[PDB]
Write a structure and sequence with these properties.
The structure is a homodimer of 329-residue chains.
Chain A: E1 2-7, E2 17-21, E3 30-40, H1 42-49, E4 58-59, E5 64-71, E6 87-90, E7 100-104, E8 108-110, H2 117-137, E9 145-148, H3 154-165, E10 169-174, H4 177-185, E11 190-193, H5 198-208, E12 214-219, H6 226-231, E13 233-241, H7 255-259, E14 264-266, H8 277-292, E15 300-305, H9 309-317, E16 324-328
Parallel strand pairs in A: 9-10, 9-12, 10-11, 12-13, 13-14, 15-16
Antiparallel strand pairs in A: 1-2, 1-4, 3-5, 3-7, 3-16, 5-6, 6-8
Helix pairs in contact in A: 2-3, 2-8
Domain Enoyl reductase (ER) (chains A, B): 11-327
Organism (chains A, B): Mycobacterium tuberculosis (strain ATCC 25618 / H37Rv)
Protein name (chains A, B): Probable quinone reductase Qor (NADPH:quinone reductase) (Zeta-crystallin homolog protein)
């Protein structure tokens, strides 16, 4: 028996119940993980509220770093380097808010000795996302300039630090002075206000880039920024629309892609960049090498005992937390 | 004084007038070309009819292969390898339907000794288009499979032969049995009917590709084929929409690009791939190397004297001409 946070009915933070729960057993292709640090994120709140549906009851959470206690059937050394005793991290766990949970081995990565559990749990999802955007969707190269919207958000901060480390000049957008400082500290060469008008904003970006425009735009904002993103691109540049935080982007007339400079539009999601354990492990290894070298840093701003998951969710939804929030079981 | 075909009023083939015309003088950055073979194409008919507007009067036509008679001011050996006496070809000439015309040196290419003037004039535009689609927009590699719509059209035929030569498997669509044979003879491994339903067609393409889908779709058709093109792509594949022969493609919900497999959508045009003389010359040289080696063949089906440009336009609009049509001055 173990401590866990279980949701039997969807709703507000008040549905999170600290319970005694059977210790999980790993099924086919799964690892059993003894948690050291548990990620708290907005997606957790969407499952909790029922905005994203799933089978009830469930133990909440998908982000965890801990040690491998056991492996399920179908987990062999032929397929994974992961072994009992290894410190690992996954953003695909079932029932992460618990002392023990399970995760598919093919979506779990080793954590190097020089990366802490709290940072691993806080960084994996945002970090894999930044990895595929920067290495696969548009492979940035030294000398490029890119535009990253929402520079002070989780992915934006990692995109900015990582691209800067790869010799890329980063221009960002943020909504407040406080976020402007966070973005500058992450390596942004220029921090801009969100666009008021697409052509005015694009004109500003072109002036910053000697008339060229940016080689790529990483747009996780969507509705409010998309027109400006498209207008800011260098000839044959890539618009990576990977989120819609402000709302959905209206259908795009393909001729707009021609007028913008024969550009590329893509709407990726992480699923298509974590297709095998080999691909997952490659992205994670490069992420944790960079964190290990302090080329990427992830601030943890809130550490709660597992029992106070309710309070963590309240503080998260109230924006009382700056930086990542974790539970320690 | 020279012979030319001049349009003083827009309209049908009847506005083409065979005239005595002053010999042109090359302006800044231009070559003076003595024509050997003149391309006849549908774009000529759009300028003739006034569908595409331009200053009247004009000598019609933009495609020509011939010898360099003289160079204008601003044309130096520092900028171009082209010299007086060289056989050259351009699809950016002014007044091609004439004994002499002008063209910007930066959009003119040398023709190797082993490529005829008629083939050069017939092949350049379609060939540069195929080059940028296959080498730049999506760089095909040996082992890829691609889908090329309108397999028996000018660009489709070159796309098919060139991709096959590069070790790519090509699937095409055509509307008739006669066109199916032309496409097969150009190297198509499979020739399909145009799509009736996007998911049915995509299911057919996935069966041909072992469930994978194609690495790229080259779609110059637009309205009637776009949904099927998007549905047929391998994960992270590229949809190159480079034409709209059937009509414009309706605005595309970006989430469709995610659902299709985190694919790329691009709407290129040749302008953005011929930005400098260096880029132009590179594409043209690779095109004419391939034609020279008979890896690419371009059928010339109609040869008219310059004076019968009217008849060439009638035959072109009546589809009495299979293969390219040229004028010989």
């Amino acid at each position: 028996s173990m401590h866990a946070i279980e949701v039997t009915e969807t709703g507000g933070p008040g549905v999170l119940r600290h319970v005694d729960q059977p210790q999980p057993q790993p099924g086919h292709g799964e690892l059993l993980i003894k948690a050291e640090a548990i990620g708290v994120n907005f997606i957790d709140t969407y499952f909790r509220s029922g905005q994203y549906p799933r089978e009830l009851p469930f133990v909440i959470g998908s982000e965890v770093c801990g040690t491998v206690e056991a492996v399920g059937p179908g987990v062999t050394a032929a397929d994974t380097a992961i072994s009992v005793g290894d410190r690992v991290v996954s953003a695909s766990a079932n029932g992460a808010y618990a002392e023990f949970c399970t995760a598919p081995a093919s979506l779990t990565a080793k954590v190097p000795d020089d990366v802490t559990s709290e940072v691993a749990a806080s960084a994996l999802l945002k970090g894999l996302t930044a990895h595929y955007l920067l290495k696969s969707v548009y492979p940035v190269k030294r000398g490029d300039t890119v535009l990253v919207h929402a520079g002070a958000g989780g992915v934006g901060l990692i995109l900015t630090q990582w691209a800067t480390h790869l010799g890329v000049r980063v221009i960002t957008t943020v909504s407040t002075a406080e976020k402007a400082k966070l973005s500058k500290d992450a390596g942004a060469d220029v921090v801009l206000d969100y666009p008021e008008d697409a052509w005015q904003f694009a004109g500003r970006v072109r002036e910053l880039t000697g008339g060229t425009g940016v080689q790529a735009v990483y747009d996780g904002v969507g509705a409010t920024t998309f027109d400006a993103s498209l207008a800011s691109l260098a000839v044959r540049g890539t618009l990576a629309l990977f989120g819609a935080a402000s709302g959905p982007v209206p259908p795009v007339d393909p001729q707009r892609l021609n007028a913008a400079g024969s550009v590329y539009l893509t709407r990726p999601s992480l699923f298509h960049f974590t297709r095998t354990g080999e691909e997952f492990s490659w992205r994670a290894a490069e992420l944790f090498d960079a964190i290990g070298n302090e080329a990427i840093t992830v601030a943890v701003g809130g550490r709660y005992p597992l029992a106070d998951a309710l309070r963590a969710h309240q503080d998260l939804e109230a924006r009382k937390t700056v930086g990542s929030v974790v539970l320690l079981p």
